[PDB]
Amino acid sequence: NWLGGLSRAAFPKRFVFGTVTSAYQVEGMAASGGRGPSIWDAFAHTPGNVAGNQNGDVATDQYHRYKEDVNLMKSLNFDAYRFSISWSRIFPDGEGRVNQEGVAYYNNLINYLLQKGITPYVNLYHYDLPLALEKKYGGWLNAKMADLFTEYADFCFKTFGNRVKHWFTFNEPRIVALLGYDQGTNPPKRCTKCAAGGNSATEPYIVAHNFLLSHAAAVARYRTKYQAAQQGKVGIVLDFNWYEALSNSTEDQAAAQRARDFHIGWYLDPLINGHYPQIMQDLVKDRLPKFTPEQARLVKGSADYIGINQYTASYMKGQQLMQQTPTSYSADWQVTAVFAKNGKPIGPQANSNWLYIVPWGMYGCVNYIKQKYGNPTVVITGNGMDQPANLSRDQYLRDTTRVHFYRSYLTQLKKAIDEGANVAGYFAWSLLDNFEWLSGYTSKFGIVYVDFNTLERHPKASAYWFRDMLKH
Ligand SMILES: OC[C@H]1O[C@@H](O[C@H]2[C@H](O)[C@@H](O)[C@H](O[C@H]3[C@H](O)[C@@H](O)[C@H](O[C@H]4[C@H](O)[C@@H](O)[C@H](O)O[C@@H]4CO)O[C@@H]3CO)O[C@@H]2CO)[C@H](O)[C@@H](O)[C@@H]1O
Ligand SMILES: OC[C@H]1O[C@@H](O[C@H]2[C@H](O)[C@@H](O)[C@H](O[C@H]3[C@H](O)[C@@H](O)[C@H](O[C@H]4[C@H](O)[C@@H](O)[C@H](O)O[C@@H]4CO)O[C@@H]3CO)O[C@@H]2CO)[C@H](O)[C@@H](O)[C@@H]1O
Ligand SMILES: [Zn+2]
């Protein structure tokens, strides 16, 4: 069957199904309703940065259309909606004055979701640092971010936490560290060779450390001030793509494990075990900041659940570990990614060049977290694939590849859960075609088509797939 035996009955009782967006990617009204600019507003408005010089000024205009979009998700039988609050929509300068119109938007959205029986899962941060904080403090390079983020988090807990019971602090700090500070292709565009300055061998580690410390401080505030009354939870969202040893050699198996440690262990070992992975300590040495015992104790156990964004997989080929002059976080891994084995590609690519369709990667990631980290509560916080630009409306709607993608990936997730993985929920990226960062509007991840000329929504085949699969 086109559902392939999948239904709510195929997953644990009370298992949560949702869709996901992020503020800058869908809201629009980027310079309206009192919102202050983020580092992404500045970046996207700079010619050459984004495909077609596009930006999120309007995006999908969810700001005005949110009731349409909530009605749609309810009609598709989803239980939950993961979205983010724009920090600069609440605090236009990142600190100080509150934008009451901004607060009103999120109240209206949260209240309508609950009215419609959709549980809000709320991210505090999704790449969108207030520009004022980047300029004044140097953003995530500054340890003061822990205080600044905590004050922002505190406001959100106070203001929305009587209704919001499922929080995330950050979205993919690895990608911020990697693209913002190693490669320098995302804001603030820092790297060794970059015009804005930087150092690809040191800054990604500083940035990751400050995300972990800020996460821990915000959760400490939640637990000490808000938890007793509000009785909600706070997690974090981490990207994890699977790495499989290219061969059964000791070298290749070590390479795959090294890649896992530099990718997900970078954050999970501090969050679960209170230290960075040993291999990163051994290889990165004095470039890897050290948690004090007090900080390690604040960070350890500070996530109530682990959000995982899972998309793809690759093979890893090893080498003899070498003494090398440090150049970048990326080069520190001492591995080679490989996308074919025995002459056959690991899988076909979606529109995004990095996204190989490899459903067994979902099983790989979830099983690995279960076995390595004491089976923590995991939520799949984003999974999906993209169509290219320039298709007709009807071609977008007949998204048979995406239907196959979800059926296969969810079957692999089911396999891991049936083997005992502690997965509490699953969220499809995305509800809507949206502003896909550097790809702008040239990458279409939605189960719902958005006509970017008219802003009309049209559910794709994959939307009706979810509706059928999720019927109560
Ligand atoms: O309906 C509005 C809109 O829907 C869009 O999506 C369509 C798909 O294009 C179409 O293929 C899909 O057909 C499903 C059907 O809904 C299921 O009920 C049926 O399930 C069968 C299954 O085939 C058997 O193997 C199994 O044993 O039994 C079940 C249940 O009896 O499977 C077919 C697919 O083969 O329906 C979607 C939703 O309508 C359309 O693209 C668009 O044109 C429509 O406007
Ligand atoms: O994109 C959809 C949606 O989900 C989330 O998107 C994240 C993904 O979770 C994350 O895996 C993805 O990471 C990519 C990254 O964007 C690429 O820049 C990077 O490219 C590699 C390249 O493949 C290599 O050949 C080269 O050597 O190195 C570069 C990196 O230096 O590959 C990784 C995947 O391995 O990034 C997405 C965001 O850009 C987000 O939460 C959401 O907002 C997205 O819309
Ligand atoms: Zn509008």
Coordinates of C-alpha atoms and ligand atoms in Angstrom, one line a residue:
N1 CA 0.0 0.0 0.0
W2 CA 1.1 3.6 -0.5
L3 CA 1.2 3.9 3.3
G4 CA 3.3 0.7 3.4
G5 CA 1.6 -0.5 6.5
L6 CA 2.3 2.7 8.4
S7 CA -0.4 4.4 10.6
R8 CA -0.6 5.7 14.2
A9 CA -1.1 2.1 15.3
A10 CA 2.5 1.3 13.9
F11 CA 4.0 3.8 16.4
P12 CA 4.0 3.9 20.2
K13 CA 0.9 5.1 22.1
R14 CA 0.8 8.9 22.4
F15 CA 3.7 9.2 19.8
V16 CA 3.7 12.9 18.5
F17 CA 3.5 13.7 14.8
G18 CA 4.1 17.3 13.6
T19 CA 5.4 19.7 11.0
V20 CA 8.2 22.2 11.4
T21 CA 9.0 25.7 10.3
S22 CA 11.3 28.5 11.5
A23 CA 10.6 32.2 12.0
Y24 CA 12.8 33.8 9.4
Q25 CA 12.0 31.1 6.9
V26 CA 8.2 31.5 7.0
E27 CA 6.9 34.6 8.9
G28 CA 7.7 37.5 6.7
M29 CA 7.0 40.9 8.1
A30 CA 10.7 41.0 8.7
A31 CA 10.9 44.8 9.0
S32 CA 7.4 45.3 10.2
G33 CA 5.3 44.8 13.3
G34 CA 8.2 46.3 15.3
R35 CA 10.6 43.5 14.5
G36 CA 14.3 44.5 14.7
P37 CA 16.8 43.1 12.1
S38 CA 18.6 39.8 12.6
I39 CA 22.0 38.8 11.2
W40 CA 20.1 37.0 8.5
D41 CA 18.2 40.2 7.4
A42 CA 21.6 42.0 6.9
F43 CA 23.1 39.0 5.2
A44 CA 20.2 38.3 2.9
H45 CA 19.9 41.9 1.8
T46 CA 23.5 41.9 0.7
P47 CA 23.8 41.3 -3.1
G48 CA 25.3 37.9 -4.0
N49 CA 24.6 36.2 -0.6
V50 CA 21.4 34.4 -1.5
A51 CA 20.2 32.7 -4.7
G52 CA 18.5 35.4 -6.9
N53 CA 19.3 38.1 -4.2
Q54 CA 16.2 36.9 -2.4
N55 CA 15.4 37.5 1.3
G56 CA 12.8 36.6 3.9
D57 CA 11.1 40.1 3.9
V58 CA 7.8 38.4 2.9
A59 CA 8.7 34.7 2.8
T60 CA 5.4 32.8 3.1
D61 CA 3.7 35.6 5.0
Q62 CA 2.7 33.2 7.8
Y63 CA 2.6 36.4 10.0
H64 CA -0.7 37.3 8.3
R65 CA -1.9 33.8 7.3
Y66 CA -1.2 31.7 10.4
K67 CA -4.8 30.7 10.9
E68 CA -4.9 29.3 7.4
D69 CA -1.8 27.3 8.0
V70 CA -3.0 26.0 11.4
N71 CA -6.3 25.0 9.8
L72 CA -4.3 23.1 7.2
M73 CA -2.1 21.2 9.7
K74 CA -5.2 20.2 11.7
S75 CA -6.9 19.0 8.5
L76 CA -3.8 16.9 7.8
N77 CA -4.2 15.2 11.2
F78 CA -0.9 16.4 12.8
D79 CA -0.8 16.7 16.6
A80 CA 1.9 19.3 17.0
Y81 CA 3.7 22.2 15.3
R82 CA 7.4 23.0 15.8
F83 CA 8.0 26.7 15.1
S84 CA 10.5 29.3 16.4
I85 CA 10.2 32.7 18.1
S86 CA 12.2 35.4 16.4
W87 CA 14.4 37.0 19.2
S88 CA 14.5 40.3 17.4
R89 CA 10.7 40.3 17.0
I90 CA 10.4 40.2 20.8
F91 CA 13.5 42.3 21.6
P92 CA 14.4 44.5 18.5
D93 CA 17.8 45.2 20.1
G94 CA 18.2 41.7 21.6
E95 CA 18.0 43.2 25.1
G96 CA 16.1 46.0 26.8
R97 CA 12.8 47.2 25.2
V98 CA 10.0 44.6 24.5
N99 CA 8.1 44.9 21.3
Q100 CA 4.5 44.3 22.4
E101 CA 3.2 43.8 18.9
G102 CA 5.7 40.9 18.6
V103 CA 4.6 39.4 21.8
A104 CA 1.0 39.7 20.6
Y105 CA 1.7 37.7 17.4
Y106 CA 3.2 34.7 19.3
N107 CA 0.3 34.8 21.8
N108 CA -2.2 34.8 18.9
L109 CA -0.4 31.9 17.2
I110 CA 0.0 29.8 20.4
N111 CA -3.6 30.4 21.4
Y112 CA -5.0 29.5 18.0
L113 CA -2.8 26.3 17.9
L114 CA -4.2 25.2 21.3
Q115 CA -7.8 26.2 20.2
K116 CA -7.3 23.8 17.2
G117 CA -5.8 21.0 19.4
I118 CA -2.3 21.3 18.0
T119 CA 0.6 21.2 20.6
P120 CA 3.1 24.0 20.2
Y121 CA 6.8 22.9 20.3
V122 CA 8.7 26.2 20.5
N123 CA 12.3 26.9 19.4
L124 CA 13.8 30.1 21.0
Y125 CA 16.6 30.4 18.4
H126 CA 16.9 29.4 14.8
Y127 CA 20.0 31.1 13.3
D128 CA 18.4 34.5 13.8
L129 CA 20.6 36.5 16.3
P130 CA 19.5 40.1 16.7
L131 CA 21.8 42.2 14.6
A132 CA 22.3 44.6 17.5
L133 CA 23.8 41.8 19.6
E134 CA 26.2 40.8 16.8
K135 CA 27.4 44.4 16.5
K136 CA 27.5 45.2 20.2
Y137 CA 28.8 41.9 21.7
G138 CA 30.3 39.9 18.8
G139 CA 27.5 37.4 18.9
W140 CA 28.4 33.7 19.8
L141 CA 32.1 34.5 20.2
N142 CA 31.2 36.3 23.4
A143 CA 30.6 34.2 26.6
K144 CA 28.2 37.1 27.6
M145 CA 25.7 35.4 25.2
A146 CA 24.8 33.0 28.1
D147 CA 23.5 35.9 30.2
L148 CA 21.8 37.6 27.1
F149 CA 20.1 34.4 26.0
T150 CA 19.0 33.5 29.5
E151 CA 17.3 36.9 29.9
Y152 CA 15.5 36.3 26.5
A153 CA 14.6 32.8 27.5
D154 CA 13.3 33.9 30.9
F155 CA 11.0 36.4 29.2
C156 CA 9.6 33.7 26.9
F157 CA 9.1 31.3 29.8
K158 CA 7.3 34.0 31.8
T159 CA 5.1 35.2 28.9
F160 CA 4.2 31.9 27.1
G161 CA 5.1 29.1 29.5
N162 CA 1.7 28.8 31.1
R163 CA 0.6 27.5 27.7
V164 CA 3.8 26.3 26.0
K165 CA 5.1 23.0 27.6
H166 CA 7.6 21.9 25.0
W167 CA 10.6 24.2 24.4
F168 CA 13.9 24.0 22.5
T169 CA 16.7 26.4 23.1
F170 CA 18.7 26.2 19.9
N171 CA 18.5 24.8 16.3
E172 CA 21.7 23.0 15.0
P173 CA 24.5 24.9 16.8
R174 CA 26.9 22.7 14.6
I175 CA 25.7 24.4 11.4
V176 CA 26.1 27.9 13.0
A177 CA 29.7 26.9 14.0
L178 CA 30.5 25.2 10.7
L179 CA 28.9 27.7 8.2
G180 CA 29.2 30.9 10.2
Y181 CA 32.7 30.4 11.6
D182 CA 34.5 27.6 9.7
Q183 CA 33.5 28.0 6.1
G184 CA 32.2 31.5 6.5
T185 CA 29.3 31.0 4.1
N186 CA 26.5 31.8 6.6
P187 CA 26.3 34.9 8.8
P188 CA 28.5 36.4 10.3
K189 CA 30.7 35.1 7.4
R190 CA 33.8 34.5 9.5
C191 CA 36.7 32.2 8.6
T192 CA 40.5 32.4 8.2
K193 CA 40.4 33.9 4.7
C194 CA 37.2 36.0 5.3
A195 CA 36.6 39.8 4.9
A196 CA 34.8 39.9 8.3
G197 CA 37.8 38.3 10.0
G198 CA 37.9 35.0 11.8
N199 CA 39.9 31.8 12.3
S200 CA 38.4 28.5 11.1
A201 CA 40.5 26.5 13.5
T202 CA 39.4 28.2 16.8
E203 CA 36.2 30.1 16.3
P204 CA 33.9 27.1 15.6
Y205 CA 34.9 25.6 19.0
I206 CA 34.4 28.9 20.9
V207 CA 31.0 29.3 19.3
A208 CA 29.9 25.7 20.1
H209 CA 31.1 26.1 23.7
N210 CA 29.0 29.3 24.1
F211 CA 25.9 27.6 22.7
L212 CA 26.3 24.8 25.2
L213 CA 26.9 27.2 28.1
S214 CA 23.9 29.4 27.0
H215 CA 21.7 26.3 26.7
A216 CA 22.7 25.1 30.2
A217 CA 22.1 28.6 31.7
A218 CA 18.7 29.0 30.2
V219 CA 17.6 25.5 31.4
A220 CA 19.0 26.2 34.9
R221 CA 16.8 29.4 34.9
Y222 CA 13.7 27.3 33.7
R223 CA 14.3 24.6 36.3
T224 CA 14.9 27.0 39.2
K225 CA 12.2 29.6 38.5
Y226 CA 9.5 28.2 36.1
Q227 CA 9.4 24.4 36.2
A228 CA 7.5 24.0 39.4
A229 CA 4.6 26.1 38.3
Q230 CA 4.7 25.4 34.5
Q231 CA 5.7 21.7 34.5
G232 CA 7.1 21.8 30.9
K233 CA 10.3 20.6 29.3
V234 CA 13.3 22.2 27.5
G235 CA 15.5 20.4 25.0
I236 CA 17.8 21.3 22.1
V237 CA 17.9 20.5 18.4
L238 CA 21.0 18.9 16.9
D239 CA 21.6 17.9 13.3
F240 CA 22.9 14.4 12.8
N241 CA 23.6 12.7 9.5
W242 CA 24.7 9.1 9.6
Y243 CA 28.2 8.0 8.9
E244 CA 28.9 4.4 7.8
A245 CA 32.4 2.9 7.6
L246 CA 33.3 2.5 3.9
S247 CA 34.8 -0.9 4.7
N248 CA 35.2 -3.2 7.8
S249 CA 38.9 -2.1 8.2
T250 CA 40.0 -0.8 11.5
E251 CA 40.9 2.5 9.8
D252 CA 37.5 3.0 8.2
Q253 CA 35.6 1.9 11.3
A254 CA 37.7 4.4 13.3
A255 CA 36.9 7.1 10.7
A256 CA 33.2 6.6 10.9
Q257 CA 33.3 6.8 14.7
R258 CA 35.5 9.9 14.6
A259 CA 33.0 11.6 12.2
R260 CA 30.1 10.7 14.6
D261 CA 32.1 12.2 17.5
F262 CA 33.0 15.5 15.7
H263 CA 29.4 15.7 14.3
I264 CA 26.9 14.8 17.1
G265 CA 29.3 13.8 20.0
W266 CA 30.5 17.4 20.0
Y267 CA 27.2 18.3 21.7
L268 CA 25.8 15.0 23.0
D269 CA 28.9 14.1 25.1
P270 CA 28.7 17.4 27.0
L271 CA 24.8 17.1 27.3
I272 CA 24.8 13.5 28.4
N273 CA 28.2 12.8 29.9
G274 CA 29.5 16.3 31.0
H275 CA 32.6 16.3 28.7
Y276 CA 33.6 16.7 25.1
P277 CA 34.3 13.4 23.2
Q278 CA 37.8 12.0 24.0
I279 CA 38.8 12.1 20.3
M280 CA 38.1 15.8 20.1
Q281 CA 40.1 16.4 23.3
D282 CA 43.0 14.4 21.9
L283 CA 43.0 16.0 18.4
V284 CA 41.8 19.6 19.0
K285 CA 43.7 20.0 22.2
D286 CA 44.1 23.6 23.4
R287 CA 41.7 24.9 20.7
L288 CA 38.9 23.1 22.5
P289 CA 37.6 25.1 25.4
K290 CA 37.5 23.3 28.8
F291 CA 34.4 23.2 30.9
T292 CA 35.1 23.9 34.6
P293 CA 33.7 21.2 36.9
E294 CA 30.8 23.5 37.8
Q295 CA 30.0 24.3 34.1
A296 CA 30.2 20.6 33.2
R297 CA 27.7 19.8 35.9
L298 CA 25.4 22.6 34.7
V299 CA 25.6 21.3 31.1
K300 CA 25.3 17.5 31.9
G301 CA 21.6 16.4 32.0
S302 CA 20.4 19.9 30.8
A303 CA 18.3 18.6 28.0
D304 CA 14.9 17.0 28.8
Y305 CA 14.9 15.5 25.3
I306 CA 17.2 15.5 22.3
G307 CA 15.9 16.9 19.1
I308 CA 17.5 15.4 16.0
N309 CA 17.3 16.8 12.5
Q310 CA 18.1 13.7 10.3
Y311 CA 18.3 13.9 6.6
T312 CA 21.1 11.9 5.0
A313 CA 24.1 9.6 5.3
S314 CA 27.5 9.0 3.8
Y315 CA 30.4 6.6 4.0
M316 CA 33.6 7.4 5.8
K317 CA 37.1 6.4 4.7
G318 CA 40.0 6.5 7.2
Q319 CA 43.6 7.3 7.2
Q320 CA 46.5 7.0 9.6
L321 CA 46.1 9.8 12.2
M322 CA 48.7 12.6 11.6
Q323 CA 50.3 15.5 13.4
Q324 CA 49.0 18.4 11.4
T325 CA 49.1 22.2 11.6
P326 CA 45.5 23.2 12.6
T327 CA 43.5 24.8 9.8
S328 CA 39.8 24.1 10.5
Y329 CA 37.1 22.3 12.5
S330 CA 36.3 20.4 9.2
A331 CA 40.0 19.4 8.6
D332 CA 40.3 18.3 12.3
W333 CA 38.2 15.2 11.8
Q334 CA 40.9 13.6 9.5
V335 CA 38.4 11.6 7.5
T336 CA 37.2 11.4 3.9
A337 CA 33.5 11.4 3.1
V338 CA 32.6 8.9 0.3
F339 CA 29.2 8.7 -1.4
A340 CA 29.5 5.3 -3.2
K341 CA 30.5 1.8 -2.2
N342 CA 31.3 -1.1 -4.6
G343 CA 30.6 1.2 -7.5
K344 CA 27.1 2.1 -6.4
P345 CA 25.9 5.5 -5.1
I346 CA 24.8 5.5 -1.4
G347 CA 21.5 6.9 -2.7
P348 CA 20.1 9.4 -5.2
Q349 CA 20.3 13.2 -4.4
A350 CA 17.3 15.5 -3.8
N351 CA 17.6 19.1 -5.0
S352 CA 20.1 20.0 -2.3
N353 CA 23.5 18.6 -3.2
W354 CA 24.3 17.5 0.4
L355 CA 21.0 15.5 0.7
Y356 CA 21.5 11.9 -0.4
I357 CA 18.3 9.9 0.0
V358 CA 19.4 7.1 2.4
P359 CA 16.5 5.9 4.6
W360 CA 18.7 3.5 6.5
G361 CA 20.6 6.5 7.8
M362 CA 17.6 7.3 10.0
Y363 CA 17.9 3.8 11.6
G364 CA 21.7 4.3 11.9
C365 CA 21.4 7.6 13.8
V366 CA 18.6 6.6 16.1
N367 CA 20.1 3.2 16.9
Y368 CA 23.5 4.8 17.5
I369 CA 22.1 7.4 20.0
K370 CA 20.2 4.6 21.8
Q371 CA 23.3 2.4 22.2
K372 CA 25.9 5.0 22.9
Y373 CA 24.1 7.5 25.1
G374 CA 21.9 5.4 27.5
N375 CA 18.8 5.7 25.3
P376 CA 17.8 9.3 26.0
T377 CA 14.4 10.6 25.0
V378 CA 14.8 11.6 21.3
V379 CA 12.4 13.7 19.1
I380 CA 13.0 13.7 15.4
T381 CA 12.7 17.4 15.0
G382 CA 13.1 17.7 11.2
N383 CA 13.2 15.2 8.3
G384 CA 12.3 15.8 4.6
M385 CA 13.7 16.5 1.1
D386 CA 13.5 19.2 -1.5
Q387 CA 12.3 19.7 -5.1
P388 CA 14.1 22.1 -7.5
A389 CA 13.1 25.6 -8.7
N390 CA 11.0 26.4 -11.7
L391 CA 8.6 23.4 -11.8
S392 CA 4.9 23.9 -12.6
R393 CA 2.4 23.9 -9.8
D394 CA 1.2 20.5 -10.8
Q395 CA 4.7 19.1 -10.9
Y396 CA 5.2 20.3 -7.4
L397 CA 2.0 18.7 -6.3
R398 CA 2.8 15.3 -7.7
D399 CA 5.7 14.8 -5.2
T400 CA 6.0 11.0 -5.6
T401 CA 9.7 11.1 -4.6
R402 CA 8.8 12.8 -1.3
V403 CA 6.0 10.3 -0.6
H404 CA 8.6 7.5 -1.1
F405 CA 11.0 9.4 1.1
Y406 CA 8.7 9.7 4.0
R407 CA 7.4 6.1 3.8
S408 CA 10.9 4.8 3.7
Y409 CA 12.4 7.0 6.4
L410 CA 9.5 6.5 8.7
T411 CA 9.7 2.7 8.2
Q412 CA 13.4 2.9 9.2
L413 CA 12.4 5.0 12.2
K414 CA 9.7 2.5 13.1
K415 CA 12.4 -0.3 13.0
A416 CA 14.6 1.5 15.5
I417 CA 11.6 2.3 17.8
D418 CA 10.5 -1.4 17.6
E419 CA 14.0 -2.3 18.7
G420 CA 13.6 -0.2 21.8
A421 CA 14.8 3.4 20.8
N422 CA 13.2 6.0 23.1
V423 CA 11.8 8.2 20.3
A424 CA 8.8 10.4 21.5
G425 CA 7.9 12.2 18.3
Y426 CA 8.6 13.0 14.6
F427 CA 8.3 16.3 12.8
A428 CA 8.4 16.8 9.0
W429 CA 10.5 19.6 7.5
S430 CA 8.6 21.4 6.3
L431 CA 4.9 22.2 6.5
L432 CA 5.5 24.8 3.7
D433 CA 7.9 25.5 0.9
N434 CA 9.9 28.4 2.4
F435 CA 13.0 30.6 2.4
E436 CA 15.8 28.0 2.4
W437 CA 18.7 30.2 3.5
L438 CA 21.4 30.3 0.8
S439 CA 19.1 28.6 -1.7
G440 CA 16.4 31.2 -1.1
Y441 CA 13.2 30.1 -2.9
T442 CA 15.0 27.7 -5.2
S443 CA 14.6 24.8 -2.8
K444 CA 11.1 23.4 -2.0
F445 CA 10.9 21.3 1.2
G446 CA 7.2 21.6 1.9
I447 CA 4.5 19.0 2.1
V448 CA 2.4 22.0 1.1
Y449 CA 3.2 24.0 -2.0
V450 CA 3.5 27.7 -1.8
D451 CA 3.1 29.8 -4.9
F452 CA 5.6 32.6 -4.2
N453 CA 3.9 35.0 -6.6
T454 CA 0.4 34.8 -5.2
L455 CA 1.3 33.2 -1.7
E456 CA -1.4 30.6 -2.2
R457 CA -1.0 27.2 -0.4
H458 CA -1.8 23.9 -2.2
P459 CA -1.3 20.6 -0.4
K460 CA 1.0 18.2 -2.3
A461 CA 0.5 14.4 -2.5
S462 CA 2.8 14.0 0.5
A463 CA 0.4 16.2 2.6
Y464 CA -2.4 13.8 1.8
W465 CA -0.1 10.9 2.5
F466 CA 0.4 12.2 6.0
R467 CA -3.4 12.9 6.3
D468 CA -4.1 9.2 5.5
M469 CA -1.3 7.9 7.7
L470 CA -2.2 10.0 10.7
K471 CA -6.0 9.6 10.8
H472 CA -7.1 9.1 14.4
Ligands
LIG1 O1 -7.6 13.9 -2.8 C1 -7.1 15.2 -2.9 C2 -5.9 15.2 -3.7 O2 -5.1 14.0 -3.4 C3 -3.8 13.9 -4.0 O3 -3.1 12.8 -3.5 C4 -3.7 11.5 -3.8 C5 -2.7 10.6 -4.5 O4 -2.3 11.2 -5.7 C6 -3.3 9.3 -4.7 O5 -2.3 8.4 -5.3 C7 -3.8 8.7 -3.4 O6 -4.4 7.4 -3.6 C8 -4.2 6.5 -2.5 C9 -5.5 6.5 -1.7 O7 -5.7 7.7 -1.0 C10 -5.5 5.4 -0.6 O8 -6.7 5.2 0.0 C11 -5.1 4.0 -1.3 O9 -4.8 3.1 -0.2 C12 -5.1 1.7 -0.4 C13 -3.9 1.0 -1.0 O10 -3.6 1.4 -2.4 C14 -3.9 -0.5 -0.8 O11 -2.6 -1.0 -1.2 C15 -4.2 -0.9 0.6 O12 -4.2 -2.3 0.8 O13 -5.5 -0.3 0.9 C16 -5.5 1.1 0.9 C17 -6.8 1.6 1.5 O14 -8.0 1.0 0.8 O15 -3.8 4.2 -2.0 C18 -3.8 5.1 -3.0 C19 -2.5 5.2 -3.7 O16 -2.2 4.0 -4.4 O17 -4.7 9.5 -2.7 C20 -4.1 10.8 -2.4 C21 -5.2 11.6 -1.6 O18 -6.4 11.7 -2.3 C22 -4.0 13.9 -5.6 O19 -2.7 13.9 -6.2 C23 -4.9 15.1 -6.0 O20 -5.1 15.0 -7.4 C24 -6.2 15.2 -5.3 O21 -6.8 16.4 -5.6
LIG2 O1 17.7 22.2 5.0 C1 16.4 21.7 5.5 C2 16.0 22.3 6.8 O2 16.6 21.5 7.9 C3 17.7 22.1 8.6 O3 18.7 22.1 7.5 C4 20.1 21.9 7.9 C5 20.4 20.4 7.9 O4 19.9 19.8 9.1 C6 21.9 20.2 7.9 O5 22.2 18.8 7.8 C7 22.5 20.9 6.7 O6 23.9 20.7 6.7 C8 24.5 20.7 5.4 C9 25.0 22.1 5.1 O7 23.9 23.0 4.8 C10 25.9 22.2 3.9 O8 26.5 23.5 3.7 C11 27.1 21.2 4.1 O9 27.9 21.2 2.9 C12 29.1 20.5 3.0 C13 29.3 19.8 1.6 O10 28.3 18.8 1.4 C14 30.7 19.2 1.5 O11 31.0 18.7 0.2 C15 31.8 20.2 1.9 O12 33.1 19.5 2.0 O13 31.6 20.8 3.2 C16 30.3 21.4 3.3 C17 30.2 22.0 4.7 O14 31.3 22.7 5.1 O15 26.5 19.9 4.3 C18 25.7 19.7 5.4 C19 25.1 18.3 5.5 O16 26.2 17.4 5.6 O17 22.3 22.3 6.8 C20 20.9 22.6 6.8 C21 20.8 24.2 7.0 O18 21.5 24.8 6.0 C22 17.4 23.5 9.2 O19 17.1 23.3 10.6 C23 16.3 24.2 8.5 O20 16.3 25.6 8.8 C24 16.4 23.8 7.0 O21 15.5 24.6 6.2
ZN3 ZN 0.6 39.9 4.5

